[PDB]
Design a binder for this molecule. Structure first.
Ligand SMILES: Nc1ncnc2c1ncn2[C@@H]1O[C@H](COP(=O)(O)OP(=O)(O)O)[C@@H](O)[C@H]1O
Lengths: 56, 187
């Protein structure tokens, strides 16, 4: 009498687990573009004088 | 300045006199960052006067005339001109540019030409724009010692740039087109 509710609840879980496993495998396999970068600055602390350009 | 020096008893009306007043102005005048307060004391005491030696042995001192002269830059009405001053025109040139331009022009207000050598002009102009400008924005003045000579220097820079060597009218194109060529080749 319960054989089908077991089987039906399982079919739903197996499909949901499949679909989530597919997106999770890519989420976990590669993760660099999903991260961040230093984005550093210039400051010009070595600028002890004027440049060679006529504009400086 | 010549008219207000006349008010003080120093009448300059001929060429030699005019050239002398220009020299006096260049050495004695300043803008003042608060015209009315500076005038309140300049007009009340000799303590804010500066002397000048005239070529003939006579001397002149200048009081509120010392700052009223450059004040015309902020108040053009002093010479009969219908204008609110160089800081309103500067403000409008920033304001009338696109909204994504305005921030860069506020931070790069460039003083050029002569008269930029009146003491306090570089600072008063930053104050006058800051007072008109939106908050958050940075208002800044550029006023190098290369002032008054900046147009000549720019000419030197430009004439010698590699990026400018194609901008020259040669004396070939000139004769084929005539002098009106300047409106097509230069600006
Ligand atoms: N210390 C100073 N005080 C007041 N005005 C000055 C001073 N130095 C220069 N100026 C004035 O600036 C003008 C010079 O204009 P200028 O910018 O040098 O034209 P140009 O670029 O073709 O040489 C003159 O009227 C001169 O009196």
């Amino acid at each position: 009498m319960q054989a089908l509710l077991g089987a039906r609840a399982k079919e739903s879980l197996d499909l949901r687990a499949h679909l989530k496993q597919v997106k999770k495998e890519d989420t976990e396999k590669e993760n660099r573009e999903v991260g961040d970068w230093r984005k550093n600055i210039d400051a010009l602390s070595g600028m002890e004088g004027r440049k060679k350009k006529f504009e400086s | 300045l010549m008219k207000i020096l006349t008010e003080r008893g120093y009448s300059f009306v001929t060429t030699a006199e005019r050239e002398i007043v220009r020299d006096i102005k260049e050495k004695l005048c300043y803008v003042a960052l608060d015209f009315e307060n500076e005038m309140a004391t300049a007009a009340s005491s000799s303590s804010l006067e500066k002397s000048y030696e005239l070529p003939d042995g006579q001397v002149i001192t200048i009081g509120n005339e010392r700052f009223r002269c450059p004040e015309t830059l902020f108040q053009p009405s002093f010479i009969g001109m219908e204008s609110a001053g160089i800081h309103e025109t500067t403000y409008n040139s920033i304001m009338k540019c696109d909204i994504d331009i305005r921030k860069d022009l506020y931070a790069n207000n460039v003083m050029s030409g002569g008269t930029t050598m009146y003491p306090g002009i570089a600072d008063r102009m930053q104050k006058e724009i800051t007072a008109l400008a939106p908050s958050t924005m940075k208002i800044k003045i550029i006023a190098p010692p290369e002032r008054k000579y900046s147009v000549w220097i720019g000419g030197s820079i430009l004439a010698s740039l590699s990026t400018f060597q194609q901008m020259w009218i040669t004396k070939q194109e000139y004769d084929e087109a005539g002098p009106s060529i300047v409106h097509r080749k230069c600006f």
